[PDB]
């Protein structure tokens, strides 16, 4: 298959179909879905690895939205990319202004 | 949905780690959102240059336009590697 022909795990064919049906342009190139699938795979791998590290730090063997929120907000680059986004049941990053702390 | 592919990626990066259904939906929405952003940027780029075909160049430039520095560099490297691999083989 095309996805397996590129050494990828994401569906190249499904991405091609979505690009075609989404009327983004009149025609769609050949390597365009391959490139898009590779980019999606890399981003998913990055966020999933960060979330897995966060979950392991919490002594849990199951990713939950809190872990995803922690992974996203703790990485400056992913935070910049995921700026105006809310994750359901993600909570917030634990912080406290230094002046509010007692003497 | 992208549940299966997200699952395979997760097992590839973290062998023994499950993922809740809510987290799977989160990841599915994230993948859809990023795909939509990239495709929209590529469409805008193609329409800019009077072009009528989204190619690997348009998506590469859209990636370079959307993602932050190191993330964009690594994503571009991965995409180029995959494209060359897919072209060489057939």
């Amino acid at each position: 298959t095309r996805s397996s022909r590129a050494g990828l795990q994401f569906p190249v064919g499904r991405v091609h179909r979505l690009l075609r049906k989404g009327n983004y342009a009149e025609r769609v190139g050949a390597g365009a879905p391959v490139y898009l699938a590779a980019v999606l795979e890399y981003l998913t791998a990055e966020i999933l690895e960060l979330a897995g590290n966060a979950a392991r730090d919490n002594k849990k063997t199951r990713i939950i939205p809190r872990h995803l929120q922690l992974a996203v907000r703790n990485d400056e680059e992913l935070n910049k990319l995921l700026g105006r986004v809310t994750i359901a049941q993600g909570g917030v990053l634990p912080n406290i202004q230094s002046v509010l702390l007692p003497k | 949905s992208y549940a299966i592919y997200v699952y395979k990626v997760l097992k590839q990066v973290h062998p023994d780690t499950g993922i809740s259904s809510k987290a799977m939906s989160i990841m599915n929405s994230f993948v859809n959102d990023v795909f939509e952003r990239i495709a929209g940027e590529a469409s805008r780029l193609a329409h800019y240059n009077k072009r009528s075909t989204i190619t690997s160049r348009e998506i590469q430039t859209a990636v370079r336009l959307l993602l932050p520095g190191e993330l964009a560099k690594h994503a571009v490297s991965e995409g180029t590697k995959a494209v060359t691999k897919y072209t060489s083989a057939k």
Binding site: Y42, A45, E77 | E70, H74
Partner: peptide, 11 residues
């Protein structure tokens, strides 16, 4: 940084 060491380590 650590991302480059992590991005290369894929398999």
């Amino acid at each position: 940084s650590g991302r480059s060491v992590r991005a290369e380590t894929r398999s």
